[PDB]
């Protein structure tokens, strides 16, 4: 008789689904879970909130494009994710939280963290299930993948009694389940890919959209090709930069607000008509502006705006169909066309309003100053985090990406507290690739002891920190005041200190010519660094 | 004259009796805060959401009535979820505000619009949403009414963005009156003569005091019981202080001794749960009779039978316990060998107990680092303690005099409250000093807190025990390729983590340097961490 | 090894916990909790609907006095008494719904029934949970009982996996738990005693109002102690009618609406402001109305009108302790007061105006004619059921309650579906006690067929049938139109012959002497009977 406990169950389920990597607070009773992770090949890393460790998880997943696991303490270590659980949810992200819970020989008695925290999770899970038997561990760990990579992709929730986890059985009588296999890809209606053709070359003024599903369909040399052989300027969303390289000859960023209240017709590719998009209505809209729509959720179609054409299916297989149908005719947006004129002669002039910010040089920095830096010295295979209001609202303009899913935000939510578990996660899924998290000092506060895990793991993560004041710039005689600002931080607060402190490197850059130093500095070290960045609180927002 | 959904919020909030809270603010929820300002309301803005909902907490503990939490809207809601629970795992109110999307923007993909009214009810006395504007008043009041009355718990109230903004004239709006305090109830007079003939009969009878003779503001009656009985009593971890804990009839030092011989125990505002071991077998006997007093009559009979149940206000029920006291004059004997063997078992044990905390070592033990704590904690203090075994020992060395002074990880056992809790109390006593112990773990969930107590010059007093994360784990741990799993830095600074953020540093090497290092944290007008750090294979057991 | 399988286990822990009555429809996979709840002591009374049968199990727990039980099929089967277990719920009555579920070994493959329904109990049940444990039954049925029954009443589901109910095991190892006590009862704050006796020597025009919590305290003989010796007169519930003999000289019952708008004081004993007492509020109230409260339930105390004294804790106790302050001092409000005669003489008028209508003789009959003939012949120690809008309404006012708990009708819910199951639950409690269930014609087709459950079991149920139309009195021209009426029903409809073909005694009464003819021979049948009472479209609802 060759025993095996319910832990190494979990773990080598889980690594025969092809998880690689696990995040999380140990504890009663997943302390072994994660021990048997280790032994079972999947790399654990050791947080320290297990709402930054939900965030590396679906990040892993984003990243890698199979799937992340985060473990949770029973009681309040798995409540503590609940958002972070959500956010997987906003952005159609698959993971998959593992928890402990009450015994079962222990129900109703009052036993440690006994709480029915199956409710909590279910509102935002495509699978929230506790384990009732311990050798059906391995279905309950395949359903879980399934529901979690299947279909429209979200969060898992696998509960685990406390007893189970530690139990002991037979290995022969262990049910184990094959592998779970990778999201197979749709094509769409033929039928809806000739009229969305059709109603392409009836556009006087169109315009493509390309939003983060593309990047989630490994599309991007599809839409590349597509918005290359249409001719048609393309709008990237904040996650989608880098799918096709910001520095596009077609790319209409530095003129959203123009492409979007003009064009009469738009080509959604694998975007929503969410808060981003301002709901495709005006006044940012036109009134009668026509949606094409590239979404393989059938659900999200004619949302706020009918759809006149809706091709559901895979992004990828889609735009391949659509790339034969232009093919077949050769046909071409005219290039001379005094849209795509518009549209230039609007980005040149945006685009020169930015340069004007960015050449000021002040003494505490301003946000167009700072982030020139930045753009200037990214590297263009790094991964780059931004999270936060301004500080990361207006990264979104000056700091480009090239490569495909290089930056990460706070995506459909706009959670916060996701830059740490997002950097933690990116260099765990990328072993020694480096990577940038920009923050505000304000998002920065949410999970600010998690440098130590890049400290205790030695992860090549260069923290930057913009001190403006707090949520908004705060002037210092705002904090002078009786009542203390609402929304105010320590505009003295030195977070490079901070992580001197957990053993990493500190810079604390007041002006240009530092944060240039600074920055190529925190690139040569093998190893963490965050670099302090005193912002100015009345620092021009707006080009 | 019109008004505001928010200043609305903050008025209904003034008129019942709130006058903190605790948020981080954004869309839609930051002119609440603002309007709770301008209302008298002291609002102290976090930088996560978790603990400001554990200091809200706080506040009704320590204040006696109602603390609040502001949280914005989707994500700011739902990373309360734990802090919410723990408030219903200690049966204590507060109220979670939380914004949610425009009712104008349903159903379009409206910024975090999310389902966060579910995430909050499996544990709230209330969860609801607001419909009309003019009606505010009404779901605040009724926020307060089911949070504080019956079985106390966390309240939810959520607001529409558009509502929060939304004016409207003054006098269309529908104003509540100010939710009365909890009642009182009085036990069944047969009940209560029972309670007092179990007790004569009992042989080797032990008073069991919990917490809820604490949130019944009943520490003056169930001294006045230990001391009319003659019982050894025992008090659990937030129990500590109601009596103090050098009284002459405290069998904490014995508590293993008294829970596995007592033939009868006497349940005062504590449930058979993890902590009391379920009173179950082999910590307690088979055979034990129960006496119990819980105004929760579902918590009657839990786990062991309850022989003699009351349920009813406990400081009332007490002092009709003490009123047929009154009449027989009964007492258990003092020179009773139920009473000299626990001061047998007791003063032994406590001399384990004081033999480690002779032990000067570098780094610093677990007993070495309290002594120095205990001999300088104020008894007029409030002492927050977190972690595993730096909380679990602490409950041991460190001494609570004066009642309500403890904070801990509570009946759900949470990690991430210990900031919260010390910036919730600092904000309900102002002038009082607020001692922080922290495990190098626990201190992990909410370390950035810290700056809120620089921003506000709090008198909170940090102290950190670095053993090496979540348990002690030697230096020879890290060496290996696979780090451990319950791991952190052993040579963090979490000193110089705060003073980066603006508070004074220290570290601790020895037990000099802590006896230093405290009393001039003590004296300092702000905030401070002392940075001990910790043998890694301290001892945990006396 | 003497063995025992599941069901057993439930069955017997149920009888030890003081269970006598469980009503339910068999199935998968709880037809053996049924076979052994009959071996093990527990009368089983097969239903045909799941909604009924826990209206059954809640009447059972409010007439009984402990706890009612009701059986269900997983799956649809306990789905299908959502709406009953709210009831219980609204009205804050114990009771237990036992329904079977998934098996532990086939969870997540599509089992037959399988699915989440301890959510769908959960927003509603004092206790809600799934059986994780074999030998841990007994733990589950004493938790159910407790939380069911202590603190505020309420219904309790016990969900139980299909594998565990016909799984065996060594009875030794069955961990069986004590019977959980009744509830206990508090006695007020005197410091509110003192006060509300106080409030009420100040009082100009009191009003007292009994609610259905002094007939769940048992506390009959306390609020007539306390109505007669101060001499306020009072106002009965619907389902306080009996606690006081309706009959008695201070019944405000005939002046309701005008003891509502003129008290400048109320005493809510054991009753909620609520929709049945028009919240308090104007125009239904005076503006400025004190209140003195008693309520267990400290959540209710001040809802919609503030409360000046609120005394929680047990009704009968308060009463008690009420009643002892008065005779201290031996107070009494002026009989001579112009408050009781003006009440008296808005009573006697309207009561003059009700007679009129009762005296009026009309074929088809009319709601008082009809109304009359059953208040004249229902015996006094019978249980009186009475469900349906204007049939339910008026029959508050007609039928009087002279014993305390003779009467069940939709309840502070105002469901529908509950006459048969109250009327069958009512028989089973009350073996050889008759019960009269009447009922309006769109009330008795939510359970028609339940008449069938009184002939299998020979119940001495009486049913009485308000054809008016359905959903309101619709004339015959009504539905000669092509548009059938929205809420109209078959005006020649005999639901006497759908009970003479389910096996029990028919009557078609169209006019007084026939009513009072067939309701004389139902009471002498020694089983189950319907009267049907063809009753005018247009009859008149007001006096
Ligand atoms: N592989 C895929 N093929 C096609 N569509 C996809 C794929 N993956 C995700 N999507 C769609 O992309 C949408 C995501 O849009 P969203 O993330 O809101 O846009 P944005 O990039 O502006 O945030 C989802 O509705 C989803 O249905
Ligand atoms: N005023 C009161 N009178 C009586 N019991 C109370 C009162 N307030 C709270 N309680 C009870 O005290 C119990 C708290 O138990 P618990 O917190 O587990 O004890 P501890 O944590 O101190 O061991 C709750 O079940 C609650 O019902
Ligand atoms: N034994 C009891 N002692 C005191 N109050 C009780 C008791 N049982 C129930 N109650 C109270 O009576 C109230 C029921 O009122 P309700 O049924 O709405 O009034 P109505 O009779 O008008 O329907 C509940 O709020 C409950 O708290
Ligand atoms: C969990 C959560 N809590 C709160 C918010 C609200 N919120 C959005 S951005 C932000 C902080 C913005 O401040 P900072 O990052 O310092 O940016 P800056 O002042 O540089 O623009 C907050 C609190 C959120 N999105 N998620
Ligand atoms: C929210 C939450 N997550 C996780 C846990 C599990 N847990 C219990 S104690 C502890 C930390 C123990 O570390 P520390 O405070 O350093 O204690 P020490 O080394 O002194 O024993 C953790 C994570 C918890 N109780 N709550
Ligand atoms: C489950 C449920 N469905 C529907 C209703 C709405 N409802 C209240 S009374 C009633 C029927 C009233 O008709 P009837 O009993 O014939 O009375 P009458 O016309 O004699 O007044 C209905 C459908 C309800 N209360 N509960
Ligand atoms: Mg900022
Ligand atoms: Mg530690
Ligand atoms: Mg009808």
Request: glycine share 10%; proline share 6%.
């Amino acid at each position: 008789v060759a025993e095996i406990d319910g832990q190494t169950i979990i773990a080598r389920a889980l690594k025969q689904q092809g998880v690689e990597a696990m995040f999380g607070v140990v504890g009663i009773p997943v302390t072994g879970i994660a021990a048997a992770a280790q032994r079972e090949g999947i790399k654990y890393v050791g947080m320290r909130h297990e709402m930054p460790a939900t965030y590396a998880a679906q990040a892993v997943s984003y990243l890698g494009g199979r799937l992340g696991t985060a473990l949770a303490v029973s009681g309040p270590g798995v409540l503590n994710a609940v958002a972070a659980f959500a956010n997987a949810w906003s952005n159609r992200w698959p993971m998959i939280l593992i928890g402990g819970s009450y015994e079962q020989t222990g129900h109703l008695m009052g036993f440690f963290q006994e709480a029915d925290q199956l409710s909590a999770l279910k509102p935002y899970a495509k699978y929230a299930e506790r384990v009732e038997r311990l050798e059906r561990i391995p279905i309950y760990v395949a359903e879980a993948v399934k529901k979690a990579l299947h279909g429209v992709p979200g969060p898992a929730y696998l509960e685990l009694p406390g007893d189970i986890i530690t139990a002991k059985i037979d290995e022969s009588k262990v049910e184990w389940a094959p592998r779970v296999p990778d999201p197979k890809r749709t094509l769409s209606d033929p039928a809806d890919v000739e009229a969305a053709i059709a109603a392409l070359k009836t556009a006087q003024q169109p315009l493509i959209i390309v939003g983060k599903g593309v990047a989630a369909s490994r599309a991007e040399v599809e839409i590349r090709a597509f918005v290359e052989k249409t001719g048609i300027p393309y709008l990237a969303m904040p996650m989608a930069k880098g799918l096709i390289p910001d520095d596009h000859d077609q790319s209409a960023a530095a003129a959203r607000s123009f492409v979007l209240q003009n064009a009469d017709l738009i080509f959604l590719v694998g975007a929503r008509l969410n808060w981003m998009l301002h709901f495709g209505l005006p006044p940012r809209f036109r009134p009668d502006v026509r949606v094409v729509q590239l979404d393989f959720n059938p659900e999200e179609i004619g949302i706020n705006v009918p759809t006149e054409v809706g091709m559901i299916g895979d992004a990828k297989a889609t735009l391949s169909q659509l790339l034969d149908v232009l093919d077949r005719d050769g046909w071409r947006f005219p290039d001379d066309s005094e849209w795509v004129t518009a549209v230039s002669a609007e980005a040149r002039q945006n685009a020169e309003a930015v340069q004007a910010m960015m050449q000021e040089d002040t003494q505490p920095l301003g946000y167009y100053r700072a982030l020139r830096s930045i753009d200037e010295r990214l590297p263009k295979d790094a991964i780059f985090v931004a999270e936060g209001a301004s500080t990361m609202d207006i990264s979104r303009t000056v700091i480009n990406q090239y490569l495909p899913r290089t930056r990460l935000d706070a995506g459909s939510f706009g959670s916060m507290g996701l830059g740490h578990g997002f950097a933690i996660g990116a260099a765990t899924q990328f072993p020694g690739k480096r990577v940038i998290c920009l923050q505000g000092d304000g998002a920065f506060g949410f999970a600010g002891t998690e440098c130590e895990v890049a400290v205790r793991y030695n992860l090549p993560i260069t923290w930057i920190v913009f001190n403006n004041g707090g949520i908004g710039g705060h002037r210092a005689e705002l904090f002078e005041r009786d009542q203390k600002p609402v929304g105010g931080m320590s505009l003295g607060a030195r977070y490079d200190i901070l992580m001197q402190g957990l053993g990493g490197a500190a810079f604390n850059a007041t002006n240009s010519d530092e944060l240039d130093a600074a920055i190529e500095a925190a690139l040569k070290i093998d190893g963490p660094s965050l670099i302090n960045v005193p912002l100015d609180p009345d620092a021009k927002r707006k080009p």
